[PDB]
């Protein structure tokens, strides 16, 4: 199956409570493996998976350097964006950035993402060609022109194509026991309206459907690396389709 | 790993 690495960065401006808070998270598939919080005492990249702790201290040094550079960039970014929008200094504003890569079952490059959002709305998105930008509002034109003058699209494309894919392959090889694992969803029915439950499966991708002669909740993390989901219909078979299932399961009361 | 160059924003 296709495996993806992503990095999510959130910077929130605090009006007078101190410097803006910065949080960075790194995900492989649906499993987090790093974490940086600006208010944490360590102020270093922290491992959140058993396998990633195998990396030597030079890896953590490099990660901390990069993440602190990102923190400084976002701290500047909040101010420059407020200036671009001519917003008042009183309000708090949020800045989000997500970037990463995907690999297919053949473990070659398949897709790359880079996205920047201001106040929960799309601001600047790297296109699928990975050589151009997509800008929505007027300040986004200025940001795109500055970025094109900086030639950052080529650098980001090179990173996503080579380094993200190579290190995703390395992480998956290191975490073969956990990352390359499919768990069959334990499925059962409860009658009261019938609720069809799929519990303790991985990854989060599942499809539950209800058919008569042929509500839903977003998949929630169980907290132990597996997920749960259920679909209820008020009154008929529940069909569960998962990557880890050789054939989809059907349940009737 | 995080990107080195290109993190510059806005």
């Amino acid at each position, epitope marked *: 199956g296709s495996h993806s690495m992503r990095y999510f960065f959130t910077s929130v401006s605090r009006p007078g409570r101190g410097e803006p808070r910065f949080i960075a998270v790194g995900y492989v598939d649906d499993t987090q493996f790093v974490r940086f919080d600006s208010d944490a005492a360590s*102020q270093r990249m922290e491992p959140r998976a058993p396998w990633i702790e195998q990396e030597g201290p030079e890896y*953590w040094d490099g990660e901390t350097r990069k993440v*602190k550079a990102h923190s400084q960039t976002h701290r500047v970014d909040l101010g420059t964006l407020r200036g671009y929008y001519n917003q008042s200094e009183a309000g708090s504003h949020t800045v989000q950035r997500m970037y990463g890569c995907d690999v297919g079952s053949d473990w070659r490059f398949l897709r790359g993402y880079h996205q920047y959002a201001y106040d929960g709305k799309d601001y600047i998105a790297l296109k699928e060609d990975l050589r151009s930008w997509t800008a929505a509002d007027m300040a986004a034109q200025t940001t795109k022109h500055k970025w094109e003058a900086a030639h950052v699209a080529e650098q980001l494309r090179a990173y996503l194509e080579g380094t993200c894919v190579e290190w995703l392959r390395r992480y998956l090889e290191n975490g073969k026991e956990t990352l390359q694992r499919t768990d069959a969803p334990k499925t059962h029915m409860t009658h009261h309206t019938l609720r069809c439950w799929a519990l303790s499966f991985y990854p989060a991708e599942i499809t539950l459907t209800w058919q008569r002669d042929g509500e839903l909740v977003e998949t929630r993390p169980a907290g132990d690396g597996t997920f749960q989901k259920w679909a209820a219909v008020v009154v008929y078979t529940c069909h569960v389709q998962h990557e880890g299932l050789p054939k989809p399961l059907t349940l009737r009361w | 790993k995080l990107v*080195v160059v290109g993190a510059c924003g806005v």
Partner: antibody
Amino acid sequence: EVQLLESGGGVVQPGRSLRLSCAASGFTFSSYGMHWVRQAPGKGLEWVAVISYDGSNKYYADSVKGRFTISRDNSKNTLYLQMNSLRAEDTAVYYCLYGGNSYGMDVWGQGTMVTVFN
Amino acid sequence: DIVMTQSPATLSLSPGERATLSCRASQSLSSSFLAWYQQKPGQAPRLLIYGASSRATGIPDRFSGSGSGTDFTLTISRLEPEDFAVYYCQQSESALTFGGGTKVEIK
């Protein structure tokens, strides 16, 4: 035994290029990024250049930007610095350093003198 | 750019006296990236403190480091005749930046 050895220093006239080579023995050279750091005679230490473990990321100081090129070759376990358009400001003792980390391992080369005059 | 300013420029202390050196960063720094070096007049610099608080291998107990954020300090509890040298502060969070250097000499 960890060891860094630098060669290529000497007297050079202004406007001419010089090459410095630092060979590392006793530790895994291919995993770590390396720095070139110069010290003027009687002056404090100044950082010149840095290179990553791939050699993909290289950075130079503001004073030496545009004239210095850092390189590494992990096959021969060597770290090179090519200095172009040398001026009277470029005279100093140069060191190749495996440092600037958090686990406390640093190795300093002997340091070779680069003097610029006529 | 990160700028590190060291104070005092020179120290004049008799042997056996306390020595305190200060290094101030232009911006907030991760405490794990500061180091303190000692350079003798005729040798290469030698790492004393790494991580702003941890001593290196084979460093006497008198050397200690403290501080966080922008301001850091290095303390020599009891000066020794061999402790008279030039002390630099270094940051490695972004590139590298050595301080001016505080030279301690006998009065």
